[PDB]
Amino acid sequence: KTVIKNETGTISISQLNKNVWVHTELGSAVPSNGLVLNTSKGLVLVDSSWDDKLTKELIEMVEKKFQKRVTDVIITHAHADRIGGIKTLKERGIKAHSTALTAELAKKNGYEEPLGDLQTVTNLKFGNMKVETFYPGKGHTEDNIVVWLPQYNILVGGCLVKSTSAKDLGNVADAYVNEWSTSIENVLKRYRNINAVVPGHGEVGDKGLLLHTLDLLK
C-alpha cells in the first residue's frame, strides 16, 4: 500500500483504501496510530498525536495532500497519544468529538476539553463517510471507545486493542484488567465481520488482534 512520510520521518500515512489512511507518529521512540478519512466535506481524523508540534505537522501534511481542510477529530481516550494536540485543534476551529467521560478526564488531567458529545453508540456522517463510535466498557482506560466504518468493516481499536508485536498489556496504571476482556468481547459481539483492525500502536491486523488482546489478559 502507498506510504507517505514527512521530511523528518516522524509522521507517516499509509493507505487502507481510496478514502481511508492510517496516520502514524513517533513520540520520544514510540509510534502511535490513528486514521485519516478523506470525505467530500473535509478530512476527519481519528485521534490527534502526542503533542501540538506533531499534530500541527500531521494536519499540514494531510491538508496539502488531500486539498481540503481537517474539520473534525474523534478522540478515543484521554491519554497524550490521543489527545496531546487538543490545543491545536481548538485554536484552529477543528471540532474535537469525545464522550463526556473522556472530556471529564481530559479536564482532570489538565488538557483542554473536547466536546463531550458522543454517547455509548453514536452514528456520524461526514459527506458520504459513515462513522460509528462505540463505548464497549472499561479496558485500557475507563473511557476508551472504538470507531467503526460500516462501509468498509474497518475497526479502529485504539489502545483497547494490542498489536501482534505487543507481548504484554503495556502501562496498566489506568486500566481495568478484570473488565477489559468483557469489553473486547462486546466489540466482537457488535462487529461480527471485520475486514481490518487498527490498534493504537503497531501494525494493522484483523480480528486476530482482539483475540491476541484476550490472550494477553489471561
Ligand SMILES: O=C(O)/C(S)=C/c1csc2ccccc12
Ligand atoms: O499503552 C498505551 O496504549 C498507552 S496510550 C499508554 C499510556 C500513555 S500515558 C499513560 C498513563 C497511564 C497509563 C498508561 C498510559
Ligand SMILES: [Zn+2]
Ligand atoms: Zn492510553
Ligand SMILES: [Zn+2]
Ligand atoms: Zn496508546
